[PDB]
Design a binder for this molecule. Structure first.
Ligand SMILES: [Zn+2]
Ligand SMILES: [Zn+2]
Lengths: 9, 60
């Protein structure tokens, strides 16, 4: 993947 | 991860903004990672995100 992995909640 | 955060070793309810360090593949709260806005984490994520652990290990 590219960059970090963040989610919204 | 996904239940316990290293910065704040305690349980939480699935909520608030979430950000995970790709280097360690660890989930943690945006607030404990200095993230206060969704926009800031958007750009930060785009440029990559380093958890509190990466900063001291990466830089000696
Ligand atoms: Zn945390
Ligand atoms: Zn890390």
């Amino acid at each position: 993947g590219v960059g970090g992995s963040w989610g919204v909640f | 991860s996904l239940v316990t955060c290293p910065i704040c070793h305690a349980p939480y309810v699935e909520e608030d903004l979430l950000i995970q360090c790709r280097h360690c593949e660890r989930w943690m709260h945006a607030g404990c990672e200095s993230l206060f806005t969704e926009d800031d984490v958007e750009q930060a994520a785009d440029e990559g995100f380093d958890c509190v652990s990466c900063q001291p290990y990466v830089v000696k």
